[PDB]
């Protein structure tokens, strides 16, 4: 899972 930004600029698992 690559780190990606969510709506609030925070880290979330990316595809």
């Amino acid at each position: 899972p690559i780190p990606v930004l969510d709506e609030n600029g925070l880290f979330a698992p990316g595809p």
Partner: antibody
Amino acid sequence: VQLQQSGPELVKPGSSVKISCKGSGYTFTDYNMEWVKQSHGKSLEWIGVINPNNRFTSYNQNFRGKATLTVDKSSSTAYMDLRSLTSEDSAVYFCAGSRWYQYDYWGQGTTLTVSS
Amino acid sequence: VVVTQESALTTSPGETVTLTCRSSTGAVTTSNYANWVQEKPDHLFTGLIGGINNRAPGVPARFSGSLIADKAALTITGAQTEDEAIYFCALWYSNHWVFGGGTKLTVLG
């Protein structure tokens, strides 16, 4: 804004320690908590990051099996546990709050000394 | 992977000084989201620049970030005596940050 870290630690090789970083004066859940190791008072090494809302973590592969990041949303506190300690782990450890690929706040540091 | 900064630089009040941040992997890009962090005595760290050349809240307007050729750069436009400090850069490589060795900036104040 205050990122208050736990106080200095003197521990024996082989033990484990848990450093805490408690945020106040800001919205704890608006930031990731990142962790950094400062060796010799000079060089900085990134350890990892945790998002307090989803517990998503990314680690520097060099700290896998050394550092474990956790959070307690409720008490606006982030934790870093360092295990199987050796003298190479002696350092000053910093937490920092980040968002949008940017550091906004930094803790004061926690000195860890690993010695017999 | 290694991030390289000037060891030390000297400037005077009111002047422009430019600090640089090089990556061993090749050209620094915008997707390295270069951060600049100021270290003042007693382990006082202040984030200055991050994201895409974004000034952190409360940071004075004289600090700005950019790319210069293949490097990231921090420009202090009209340096102040209080800017004498150590400046670290950090670059993002997909899933981790790497810090440079820091630049000791003298501001002859």
